[PDB]
Amino acid sequence: DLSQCDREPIHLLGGIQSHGVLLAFRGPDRLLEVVSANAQALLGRPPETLLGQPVGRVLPAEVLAQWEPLVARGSVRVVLPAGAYRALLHESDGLTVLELEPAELQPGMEETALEVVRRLVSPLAGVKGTQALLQTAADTVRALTGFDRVMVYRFDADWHGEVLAESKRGGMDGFLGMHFPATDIPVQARALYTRNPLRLIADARARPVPLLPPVVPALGRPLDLSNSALRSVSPVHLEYLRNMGVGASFSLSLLKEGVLWGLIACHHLEPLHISHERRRACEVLTQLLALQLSAEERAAEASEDAHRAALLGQLATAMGEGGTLEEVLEKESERVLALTGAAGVALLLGEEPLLVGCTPAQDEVEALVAWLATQPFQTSFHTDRLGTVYPPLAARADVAAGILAVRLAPAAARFAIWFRPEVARTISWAGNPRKPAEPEPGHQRLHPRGSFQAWEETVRDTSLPWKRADLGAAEGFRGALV
Amino acid sequence: DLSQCDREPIHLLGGIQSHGVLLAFRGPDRLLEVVSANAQALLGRPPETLLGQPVGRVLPAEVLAQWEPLVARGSVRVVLPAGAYRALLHESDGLTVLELEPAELQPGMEETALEVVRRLVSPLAGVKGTQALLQTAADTVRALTGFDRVMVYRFDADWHGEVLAESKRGGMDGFLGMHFPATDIPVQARALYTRNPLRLIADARARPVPLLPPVVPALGRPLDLSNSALRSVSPVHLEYLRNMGVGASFSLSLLKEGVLWGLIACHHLEPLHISHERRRACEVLTQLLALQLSAEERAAEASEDAHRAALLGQLATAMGEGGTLEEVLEKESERVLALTGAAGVALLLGEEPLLVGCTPAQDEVEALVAWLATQPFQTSFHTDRLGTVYPPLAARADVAAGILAVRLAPAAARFAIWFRPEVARTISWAGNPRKPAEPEPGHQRLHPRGSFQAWEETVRDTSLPWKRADLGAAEGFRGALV
Ligand SMILES: *CCC1=C(Cc2[nH]c(Cc3[nH]c(CC4=NC(=O)C(C=C)=C4C)c(C)c3CCC(=O)O)c(CCC(=O)O)c2C)NC(=O)[C@H]1C
Numbered sequence: 005d006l007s008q009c010d011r012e013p014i015h016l017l018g019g020i021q022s023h024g025v026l027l028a029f030r031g032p033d034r035l036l037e038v039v040s041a042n043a044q045a046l047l048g049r050p051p052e053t054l055l056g057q058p059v060g061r062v063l064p065a066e067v068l069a070q071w072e073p074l075v076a077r078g079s080v081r082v083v084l085p086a087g088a089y090r091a092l093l094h095e096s097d098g099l100t101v102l103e104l105e106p107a108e109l110q111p112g113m114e115e116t117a118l119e120v121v122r123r124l125v126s127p128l129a130g131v132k133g134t135q136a137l138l139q140t141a142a143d144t145v146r147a148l149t150g151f152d153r154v155m156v157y158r159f160d161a162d163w164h165g166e167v168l169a170e171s172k173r174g175g176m177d178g179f180l181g182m183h184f185p186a187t188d189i190p191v192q193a194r195a196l197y198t199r200n201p202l203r204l205i206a207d208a209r210a211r212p213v214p215l216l217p218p219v220v221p222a223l224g225r226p227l228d229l230s231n232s233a234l235r236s237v238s239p240v241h242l243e244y245l246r247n248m249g250v251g252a253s254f255s256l257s258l259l260k261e262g263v264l265w266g267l268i269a270c271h272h273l274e275p276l277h278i279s280h281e282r283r284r285a286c287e288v289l290t291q292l293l294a295l296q297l298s299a300e301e302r303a304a305e306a307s308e309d310a311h312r313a314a315l316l317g318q319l320a321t322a323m324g325e326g327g328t329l330e331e332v333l334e335k336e337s338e339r340v341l342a343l344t345g346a347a348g349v350a351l352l353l354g355e356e357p358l359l360v361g362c363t364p365a366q367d368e369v370e371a372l373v374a375w376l377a378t379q380p381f382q383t384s385f386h387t388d389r390l391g392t393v394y395p396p397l398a399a400r401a402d403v404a405a406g407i408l409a410v411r412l413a414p415a416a417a418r419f420a421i422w423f424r425p426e427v428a429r430t431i432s433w434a435g436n437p438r439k440p441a442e443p444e445p446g447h448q449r450l451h452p453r454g455s456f457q458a459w460e461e462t463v464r465d466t467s468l469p470w471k472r473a474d475l476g477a478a479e480g481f482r483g484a485l486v
Numbered sequence: 487d488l489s490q491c492d493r494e495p496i497h498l499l500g501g502i503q504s505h506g507v508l509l510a511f512r513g514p515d516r517l518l519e520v521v522s523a524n525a526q527a528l529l530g531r532p533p534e535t536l537l538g539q540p541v542g543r544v545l546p547a548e549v550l551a552q553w554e555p556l557v558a559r560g561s562v563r564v565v566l567p568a569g570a571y572r573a574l575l576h577e578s579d580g581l582t583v584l585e586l587e588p589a590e591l592q593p594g595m596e597e598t599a600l601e602v603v604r605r606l607v608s609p610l611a612g613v614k615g616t617q618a619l620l621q622t623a624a625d626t627v628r629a630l631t632g633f634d635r636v637m638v639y640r641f642d643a644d645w646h647g648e649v650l651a652e653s654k655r656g657g658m659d660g661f662l663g664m665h666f667p668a669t670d671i672p673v674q675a676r677a678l679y680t681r682n683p684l685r686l687i688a689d690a691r692a693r694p695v696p697l698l699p700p701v702v703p704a705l706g707r708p709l710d711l712s713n714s715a716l717r718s719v720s721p722v723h724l725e726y727l728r729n730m731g732v733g734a735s736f737s738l739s740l741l742k743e744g745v746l747w748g749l750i751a752c753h754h755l756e757p758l759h760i761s762h763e764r765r766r767a768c769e770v771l772t773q774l775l776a777l778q779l780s781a782e783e784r785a786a787e788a789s790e791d792a793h794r795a796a797l798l799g800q801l802a803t804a805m806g807e808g809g810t811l812e813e814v815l816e817k818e819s820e821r822v823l824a825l826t827g828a829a830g831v832a833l834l835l836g837e838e839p840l841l842v843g844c845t846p847a848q849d850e851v852e853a854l855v856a857w858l859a860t861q862p863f864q865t866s867f868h869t870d871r872l873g874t875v876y877p878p879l880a881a882r883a884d885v886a887a888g889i890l891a892v893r894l895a896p897a898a899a900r901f902a903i904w905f906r907p908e909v910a911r912t913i914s915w916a917g918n919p920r921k922p923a924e925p926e927p928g929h930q931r932l933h934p935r936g937s938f939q940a941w942e943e944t945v946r947d948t949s950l951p952w953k954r955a956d957l958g959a960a961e962g963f964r965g966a967l968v
C-alpha cells in the first residue's frame with residue numbers, strides 16, 4: 005500500500021545542507037539560475053546580486069580556470085582563500101550546476117584507505133564465515149572515516165530488513181541484529197539508491213538552506229537535486245535522527261548484479277565531514293563486499309551440491325542393484341528425506357502411498373493430492389505457508405509447512421511431496437513492528453518513531469527457505485522416475 | 487628433476503641487486519653479522535671494516551630512532567643524505583636483515599595506485615569477455631609500473647603455457663596470441679613463487695655483486711636470501727634476456743584459490759625500478775583478477791548447471807510420454823546428443839547398440855566394451871587421447887577422438903559411450919621447443935635458446951575437453967536409464 009512515506013517527492017525540495025555552493029548555469033554565458041542563500045560566505049558578493057550574470061563576473065582564477073577540467077574530468081581542486089573545497093558537476097534541467105564543498109587535507113587517504121582495503125581482500129577472505137566479510141566492511145568504514153557504530157542492514161523479500169554487523173565504542177546502544185521496518189527506506193528514496201549510492205546527512209542537527217528562486221523558471225518545481233553530492237534530505241528523515249542521537253548518519257549503499265542488497269549506516273554522537281574523494285572510496289569498499297558476496301554464496305552452491313548429488317548418486321545405484329521400486333525408495337529415502345533435509349515424503353506411483361519419514365496419515369495426503377491437481381505450475385509448486393494455501397493441513401504445522409511438488413506425468417496425479425515444518429525464530433523489531441511512523445489527528449502530517457527498544461515478534465507456523473539446489477535436486481529426480 | 491636446468495640451488499646463491507643493500511645483524515644484543523659488498527655508498531666506511539659492532543654503531547642516528555618502529559611496524563621511512571632509501575625486512579635465517587632501498591619520488595605513486603584499482607573493479611566489469619576482464623586489469627598494472635610490455639599468462643594442463651594478453655606501446659614486438667615452453671619457470675621457481683609473489687631484475691644487464699663472506703659462519707652455504715627484494719637470480723634467467731629486447735623483468739603471483747594460475751612479468755627496452763609500496767600495489771592487483779576470474783568460473787558453472795536443467799527437463803518429458811526408449815530417443819537423440827557437449831553417441835543396452843547421429847561401425851562399438859570391461863573405473867572415462875591409450879581406433883580423427891562412459895548397471899558390461907572428433911587448431915610456437923636451451927660441448931653449463939620466431943604446430947588430435955557442466959550431465963543419466 006503506497007503512502008506519503010513513498011508519495012512525497014524527495015529529489016526536489018529547496019536544495020542543500022548548509023556548507024555548499026550551487027551557482028547554476030542556463031545557457032552559454034553560464035548565468036546564475038538557481039544560486040544559494042548560503043553563497044555570501046564564499047565568493048564575496050551576495051547571490052541575488054550575481055543571479056542574472058556570467059561566471060566571468062562570478063568565479064575566481066582557482067575554480068574558474070579549472071572550469072575547463074570540470075567538464076574534462078568530473079572533479080577539480082579550487083584552493084581559494086577559505087581553504088580547499090571540492091566542485092563536482094553534471095548536466096541537470098537546463099543546468100551545468102557546479103556543486104562544491106570541503107576537501108580532505110591529509111595524505112592519509114591512499115595509505116589509510118589501502119591498509120584498510122587489503123583487510124577486506126587478503127589471501128583468502130572467508131576462512132570462518134560471511135559474518136567476517138559483513139563485519140570487516142563495518143569495522144573498516146567506521147575505522148576509515150573515523151566513527152562510532154555502523155551496520156550492514158540488508159533488505160529482504162518484503163523490502164523489510166535487518167542489521168548484520170556492529171563495531172563501536174563500548175558506550176552507545178546499537179541495534180545489533182533486530183529486524184526493523186520496510187516503511188523506512190521506502191521505494192522513492194531507496195530506488196534513488198540504485199542511481200545515487202552515497203548520502204551525507206551530517207551535522208543533520210542543523211537547518212536546510214534554500215536555492216534561488218524556488219521554481220527553476222522554465223520547469224515549475226524546484227531543481228532536480230538528486231544526482232547532486234548535496235541533498236538537504238527531508239524533515240520526516242531528520243525529525244527521526246534527532247530521536248536516535250545523531251548529528252550525522254552516513255549510509256554508503258550497496259549492489260552486486262543490478263539489484264540492491266542493503267546499506268552501510270554509520271551513527272556518530274556529534275557531527276563529522278567526509279570528502280567527495282573518500283565517500284567516493286567508501287563506495288569503492290561497499291562495492292567490494294558486493295563481489296565477494298556474489299563470489300561464494302555462488303560457489304557455496306557448486307561445493308554444497310556435490311555433497312547433495314552424492315546423495316542422489318547413492319539413490320541412483322540403488323536403482324542399479326535389482327528392480328525394487330518400493331523397498332529402494334524406502335532405504336535410500338533416508339537419503340531423500342535428507343536431499344532437502346526434511347521429516348517425510350508420500351509418493352503416489354499408482355497404488356496407495358508408500359509414505360515414509362515422519363509425515364501425516366494417508367487420509368490427509370489423498371485430500372491434498374486432489375487439491376494440488378487444482379493448482380497451476382509446470383513442475384513443482386512450493387509453499388512455506390502451508391495454512392496460507394491449503395489450511396486443511398494447518399494443525400500439521402509441526403511436520404508440514406512447505407511441500408515440493410513434482411508432476412511425474414501430464415494428465416495424472418502421479419507425484420511425490422514432502423513435509424518441512426515450523427521453527428522458533430525471534431527476528432526482534434525496534435518497537436512494536438505494527439506502528440513504524442505515527443502522526444497527529446489528520447493524516448497528511450506524520451512524524452518519526454521515538455522508540456527502538458527491542459519489542460520481540462515470533463515468525464511462527466513458518467518454515468525454512470528453499471536454497472537453489474532444493475528446487476534443482478527435484479528436476480534431476482523427475483528423470484530418475486519417469 | 488631434468489638436466490642442469492634441474493638442480494641449481496637458485497635462492498642460496500649469494501649475489502644481490504645494486505640499488506638496494508641487504509645486510510643482517512645476527513645475535514641477541516643485536517650485532518652486525520654479515521655485511522653486503524657495496525654495503526657502503528650509504529654507510530660511509532669500507533664494507534669489511536665493521537663486521538662486529540652492535541645494531542647501530544654503524545648505520546646513522548636517523549635509522550637508530552627508526553630501528554624501533556620497524557620491529558613493531560615491519561616498514562619505516564629511513565632518509566640519509568643521497569636522496570635516500572627505505573628497508574623492508576623479515577628474519578631469513580637466525581639473523582634478521584636490512585633491505586635499505588629507494589623510495590617514492592612523488593606522492594602520485596599511490597594516487598594512481600588506487601584509481602587503477604577502480605578500472606579493474608567497477609560492478610559491470612567483465613561485460614565484453616574475460617579475455618577483456620584479464621586484459622582490463624593487465625592494462626592498469628602496466629599503467630603504474632612504467633614498464634613497456636606486460637603479459638598476464640596462464641599455465642594449461644602441463645606446467646607449460648601461452649602469452650594470452652598483451653598491451654605494449656609503439657613499435658613493440660608482441661606475443662598478442664603467441665605461445666611458449668615449460669622449461670622456463672622450472673620446478674625451482676614456484677614453491678618460491680607461492681609464498682612471495684614479486685621478483686625484480688631491474689638493471690637486468692648490470693652484473694650482480696658479492697656479499698661478504700660468501701658462506702655463513704654458523705650454517706654452511708650462501709645466506710638463503712629466499713624472501714627479499716634486491717636479491718639476484720639463477721645466472722641463467724637474466725641470461726635468457728641479454729638475447730632479447732631485455733629491459734628488466736617484473737613478475738607476480740595469481741595463486742588462484744590455492745594453485746598458481748600463472749603470473750604477469752613486464753620488461754622495458756632498458757632500466758627502471760619501482761618501490762616497496764608500489765610493489766605491494768602491484769601485488770594487490772594480481773590478488774585481483776585472481777579473485778576476479780575465481781568469481782567468474784565459479785559463476786558461469788552455476789549458469790551451465792541451471793542451463794541444462796532446462797535441457798534435461800525437455801528430455802525427461804519426452805522420456806515419460808510414449809512407447810519405449812528407441813522411439814522417444816530417435817528425435818530426443820539430437821537433444822541428448824547436445825549434452826556431453828554433444829558430438830556423437832553409442833548405447834549398449836544388451837542388443838546391438840544404436841548410432842543415434844554420427845558414429846562408427848557396430849563392430850568397433852563392441853570392440854570398445856571388450857577393452858573397457860577389462861580395465862578400471864567406478865564409472866566413465868573421458869580420455870581425449872583415445873587413439874594412443876587404445877589404438878584399434880587410432881585413425882578416427884573424423885567420428886571419434888575421445889569417449890564418455892557410464893556404468894548402466896555397475897558390475898556388468900552395459901555402457902553408453904560418446905565419439906568426439908579430432909580438431910585442427912593452429913599453434914604459433916616461439917622458436918623451437920626441441921631447443922629448451924642449447925648447451926656447450928659437455929652438457930654441464932647451459933646458456934639459452936637465442937631465437938623466438940613464429941613456429942607452426944597445426945596438430946591433428948585430442949578433443950575439446952569435457953568440463954564439469956559436460957561430464958556432469960551423466961551422474962543424472964546413470965539414474966535415468968534404470
Ligand atoms: C513517511 C516516510 C518515512 C521516512 C522517510 C525516509 N525514510 C528513509 C530511510 C532510512 N531509515 C533508516 C533507519 C535506520 N537507522 C539505522 O541505524 C539504519 C541502518 C543500520 C537505518 C536504515 C535509514 C538508515 C534510512 C536511510 C539511510 C540513511 O538514513 O542514511 C529516507 C532516506 C532519507 C532520504 O531522503 O534519502 C527517507 C526520506 N522515514 C520514516 O520513518 C517514515 C515516516
Ligand SMILES: *CCC1=C(Cc2[nH]c(Cc3[nH]c(CC4=NC(=O)C(C=C)=C4C)c(C)c3CCC(=O)O)c(CCC(=O)O)c2C)NC(=O)[C@H]1C
Pocket residue numbers: 490491492496637669670671672674675678685686687718719720722723726735736737749750751752922923932933934
Ligand atoms: C636451464 C634452466 C633454466 C632457467 C632457470 C630460470 N628461469 C627463470 C625465469 C623466468 N622465465 C619466465 C617466463 C616468462 N614470463 C614472461 O612474461 C615471459 C615473456 C616475456 C617469459 C619467457 C619467467 C616469468 C621467469 C621468472 C619471472 C621473472 O623474470 O622474474 C628463473 C627464476 C629465478 C627466480 O625465481 O628468481 C630460473 C631459476 N630458465 C630457462 O629458460 C632454463 C634455461
